[PDB]
Amino acid sequence: MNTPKEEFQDWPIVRIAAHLPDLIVYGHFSPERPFMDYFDGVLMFVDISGFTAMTEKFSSAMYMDRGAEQLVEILNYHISAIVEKVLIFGGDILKFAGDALLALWRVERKQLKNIITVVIKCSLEIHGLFERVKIGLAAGHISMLVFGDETHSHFLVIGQAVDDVRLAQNMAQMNDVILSPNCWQLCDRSMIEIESVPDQRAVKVNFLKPPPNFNFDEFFTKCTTFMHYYPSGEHKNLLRLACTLKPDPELEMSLQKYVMESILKQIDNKQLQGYLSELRPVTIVFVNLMFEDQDKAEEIGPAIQDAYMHITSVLKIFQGQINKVFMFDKGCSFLCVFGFPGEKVPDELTHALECAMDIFDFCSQVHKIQTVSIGVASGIVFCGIVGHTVRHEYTVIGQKVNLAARMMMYYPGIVTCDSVTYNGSNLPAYFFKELPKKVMKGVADSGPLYQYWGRTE
Amino acid sequence: MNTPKEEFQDWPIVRIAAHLPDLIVYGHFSPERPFMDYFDGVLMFVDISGFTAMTEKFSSAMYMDRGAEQLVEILNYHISAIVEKVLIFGGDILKFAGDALLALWRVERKQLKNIITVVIKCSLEIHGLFERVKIGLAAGHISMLVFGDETHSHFLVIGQAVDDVRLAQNMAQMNDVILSPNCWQLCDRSMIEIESVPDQRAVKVNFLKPPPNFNFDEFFTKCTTFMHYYPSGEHKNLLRLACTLKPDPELEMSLQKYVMESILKQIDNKQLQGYLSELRPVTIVFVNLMFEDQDKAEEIGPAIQDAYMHITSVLKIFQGQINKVFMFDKGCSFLCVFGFPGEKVPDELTHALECAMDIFDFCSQVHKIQTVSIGVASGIVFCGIVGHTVRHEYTVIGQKVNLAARMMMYYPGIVTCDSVTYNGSNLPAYFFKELPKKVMKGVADSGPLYQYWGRTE
Amino acid sequence: MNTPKEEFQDWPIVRIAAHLPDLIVYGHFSPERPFMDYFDGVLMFVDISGFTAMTEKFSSAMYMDRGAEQLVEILNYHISAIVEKVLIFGGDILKFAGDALLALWRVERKQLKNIITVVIKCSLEIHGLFERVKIGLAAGHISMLVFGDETHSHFLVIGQAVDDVRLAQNMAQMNDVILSPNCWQLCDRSMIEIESVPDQRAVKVNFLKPPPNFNFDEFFTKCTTFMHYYPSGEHKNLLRLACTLKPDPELEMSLQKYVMESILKQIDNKQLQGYLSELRPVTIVFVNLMFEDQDKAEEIGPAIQDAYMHITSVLKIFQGQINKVFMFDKGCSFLCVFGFPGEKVPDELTHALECAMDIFDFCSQVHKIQTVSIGVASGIVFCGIVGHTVRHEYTVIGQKVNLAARMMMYYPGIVTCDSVTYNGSNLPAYFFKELPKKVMKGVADSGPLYQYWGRTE
């Protein structure tokens, strides 16, 4: 009697799970919104903007109309190698963004010290791949927020360690590994030689020099005792346990709400697998919400949910999409896009600005939101699924993405827009104010910027 | 000199063969129609209506427009496991229908007794997968009928054992294995403890308790001597020998005639592989032909061919399709569908009824057809390819499928239609008669039913 | 710590490389056009017209509109086996054409003798696959020419050995292996029994009978010392080293210029993988350029580049495409196609003829082109990607392809067209001259042929 080998793990639920971290896939938490949970862990923030500032070159006529395809190919080739390292070292990749990848090792407080050693070794091996990234590491308390409505879900991690991992990454230069102050306080200092960072309490890792009898392979195996989903046994040849998920309609109903409908259409083999890799004109509406206090989801969770409920209703009118949400220094940011593939509407510029002002006016009145700021920028951006086969996400990359992001931070409390949006809106000129030009990070020659003042005085 | 490993078995002819049993793939019989052949074997009828009555839940708004995709995913996950068991135990899966799967072990008469033991063990292992199916087993003489024209082919198995396997399956409750009276007469009673079935000559298998020195693995190997196509040797890791078919234009020309053109288009990579999984509105025209004598293909074969020739010409006018043909208790049934994906026409309801009446009038005059009955029902049905990667078939599932099927049996000798068809036809009301409402199996609240009386008195 | 196995080699750059020989993939030569290089090697010309004269049968109504699909399936099944033999024996497949496959073993002059032995054994093993091809072998100096513009590239091999391999193949009968005179002069005569060819200096291989202590496996291994890209070590299970190419935007930019945009669209998963396999009506414009001297790229290279520059500008107006370029007996031939899938225009016939006359008039004035001849033929041709998964090319096959090719050779110095083109052009009849009918190889009943004389006297 024969024993044919199994082949089939390529179910829709597995394809959906590629777009999500284990934090969500195996979370099995309540469907109430907002949902908040609390834990401890180590965060790794890998800055990949050496690789993503290349989107300019790929718009060149040299690439003969295959710019988007070449860009996603070379990006995924390099990001895939980073992903594999994170996953084999036991990390859960939470999110991809144009300029970064955030990973989490969730553990009980008593194992933080040893897990930081694992994460530092992982970091050093990532830098070894490119002998061009910057790595910030943090550790400590982490809060998770899940918000959404009956058809869509989003999640965020928040807290001091999340803020810390961003600050640490910003301090880093090429090939640096920077530990947040609490990570350095928590780590095993017998193992790692550091140096101080000027004017900073964070530290830079110079060396991982373990004691004479230390065996990293045996140490790592001991650490896998605390990793709930590390592929093992019969499945030790897989990068993710999620690769083994089996059909389960209740679970798939839950997980699909995190993924854009156009991606679900490709997952269902109802759209060509390359339709979503494109250089295309879009309008970015980057919404920033600032609170009094950054690291307490119990106060900001309800506010973000209330904002989200209004944002989704405004965007739906114009097939706008929330591509990503981020949280830093008591600012929660929504990266909204008008014009994604198959979602284009006429008067995109006008409607982007009217939607921004609607969001601005509503969210300004939401309890506990202190300031709303919105940047609106329009131009050619790269869109596509970025990452590894087993862990990837739809992402947008481009100068206009970075411009809208810097505008909402450098011009707080107002709706701003770039010259493309201003000139191509069908709105009267006195609806706008020409702004002073500010030197903004990563922005060279943004063009004239405007405040959308709106229809009345 | 290198020895690269072979990879390629994914030819069109192999993809086509997934949709067909070995009875056809390796049949190499005449192209004359009708064709009849005669043999002996064991039939297994696995009732999967615990799984297919779920189509209701998947039309719920809870599934956010991915009902069809979730349904085919979970169905195929469970049906695939049944298929693998049947195939490793040496069976040939003849047909899939919404509510069942029919498999055949064809053998010489002298090996029936031992093959029934194999099939009973297979049955018990299928029930073990779900520790929700019902299994009927029959054995004896089996006739095969192949009918069609120059471009399309269909096949049927007929005879007392085919009738027996249906009756046995109907007697079964969840987790039962029921042996037809001839199967019990033919089987190895030293091996299996049975109990009587009230008012029935069939029996229920309680236990497979073989003698002290019995080794099932060695017994099965001896039984593979009589299985012409059991994967073996270099190919012992395959579920089907058909996986190894090599291009052969004359054979592919023959096999493609059994498969719908929309499926061939997907096989040829000219249509997206998920286009055919849909919840869509269709009209089912379920045609039943009753003969004087059920189990003699020599008399009914020519009649079915003559009917088919007319049915295909009527359907072609409106891109109707024969999805399945079945044979029971001297009734041959055609499951016809108007509105399959890419085959929709306007006035579908009117044309369904006019086509039914045309079929009715013609087939009523075919020699040896005693009664024609046609049920017409319209609504949302699931359509998609159901089964295992190596053995699957396009199938339709839904309350309206079951309703049309019950209508042709409970209202024999006439054309009947449901309320959706009546209300949405463009035909005058006096073309119809409102019928008494009958309690019908599996039908709850069918709605008012009508006879299509037709244009004149 | 787990060690998952690598899976991913299916990058766009790898898919592109399937369409190209190693001569180009690993060439890393200048982007100047024309580019010429010079080397030595052994050529094998495998004539597959036993297999490709079948396109007639597959247009029959017997194939029920799946003629193209069945044809490409059976062709690729047989051609794939030839390709695998060539590749394992160390050859580089340069080109596929309807009626042939050309392969190259490039080596230093001192290793020619031993490589010819390898190539003869390869040839005999190819004939063993079909126990229906004809094989010609040549050896000696080979020139390579690369021509094109900033977006498209084409290459050719030229010289006496290239002419020789064609002549040798023409002399061959079914199952023959014919050695060109220089190949016989260069080979190891202790190894191979030959017989003379009537009126020819070429020879036919009767037998490969090596000396008593000869071990072909050990001999082949010694010969792999001179094969730069023979898959080895960790990659000894691959047919091509190109299967391991990694993303490299500068290299992909270079390689894509050799591949049609419709193929690139399929490679990018933006078109269905079977869209390009079709039986469709096209117009073939077969352009032949004859020079004074055939085997010196230094003189003919600049002329072909100048012609190409004009040809591409004329074709672009009507989405005509260069499908293949060939070089024989100081004739360089361009196989141009109007009407490829997704490239159809109205008045295709008129524009084909006007484009031919434009090309004729320009190329007739190019320095060192002695004669231009153009054949124009219109009808149903097979189009599709022909070859092995790892080495394949888009190809056109059909009686009208062969007719246009014979017309440009049998009617030199003029533009000729077939009856379909003449009757369906919108041009006046006195623009044409009815020609004497010539008996042409492989052409039976071409129909009346015409010279396109053009608008004035």
Curated annotation (Swiss-Prot), chains A, B, C:
Tissue distribution: Detected in airway epithelial cells and testis (at protein level). Weakly expressed in multiple tissues. Expressed in brain, heart, kidney, liver, lung, pancreas, peripheral blood leukocytes, placenta, skeletal muscle, stomach, thymus, airway epithelial cells, duodenum, jejunum and ileum. Very low level of expression in bone.
Keyword Cell membrane: yes
Binding residues for Mg(2+) 2: D47, I48, D99
Localisation: Cell membrane; Cytoplasm, Cytoskeleton; Cytoplasm, Perinuclear region; Nucleus
Domain (Guanylate cyclase) ranges: 42-169, 283-408
Binding site for Mg(2+) 1: D47, D99
A cellular-component GO term for this protein: astrocyte end-foot
The keyword Manganese belongs to this UniProt entry's keyword annotation: yes
Principal location: membrane
BP-aspect Gene Ontology terms: cAMP biosynthetic process; epithelial cilium movement involved in extracellular fluid movement; glucose catabolic process; intracellular signal transduction; mitochondrial ATP transmembrane transport; negative regulation of cardiac muscle cell contraction; negative regulation of mitochondrial membrane potential; negative regulation of reactive oxygen species biosynthetic process
Residues annotated for hydrogencarbonate binding in this entry: K95, V157, R166, M327
Modifications made to the protein after synthesis: Cleavage may occur to generate the active 48 kDa form.
Alphabetical keyword list: ATP-binding, cAMP biosynthesis, Cell membrane, Cell projection, Cytoplasm, Cytoskeleton, Lyase, Magnesium, Manganese, Membrane, Metal-binding, Mitochondrion, Nucleotide-binding, Nucleus, Repeat
Top-level division of the source organism's lineage: Eukaryota
Gene Ontology MF: a single term: ATPase binding
Positions of ATP binding: D47, I48, S49, G50, F51, T52, D99, K134, V396, N402, L403, A404, A405, R406
Free-text comment about domains: The N-terminal guanylate cyclase domains are required for enzyme activity. Fragments or isoforms containing the first 470 amino acid residues are fully active.
Family the UniProt entry places it in: Belongs to the adenylyl cyclase class-4/guanylyl cyclase family.
Function: Catalyzes the formation of the signaling molecule cAMP. May function as sensor that mediates responses to changes in cellular bicarbonate and CO(2) levels. Has a critical role in mammalian spermatogenesis by producing the cAMP which regulates cAMP-responsive nuclear factors indispensable for sperm maturation in the epididymis. Induces capacitation, the maturational process that sperm undergo prior to fertilization. Involved in ciliary beat regulation.
Disease as annotated in the protein's UniProt record: Hypercalciuria absorptive 2: A common type of hypercalciuria, a condition characterized by excessive urinary calcium excretion. Absorptive hypercalciuria is due to gastrointestinal hyperabsorption of calcium and is a frequent cause of calcium oxalate nephrolithiasis.
Name the UniProt record assigns to this protein: Adenylate cyclase type 10
Organism field: Homo sapiens
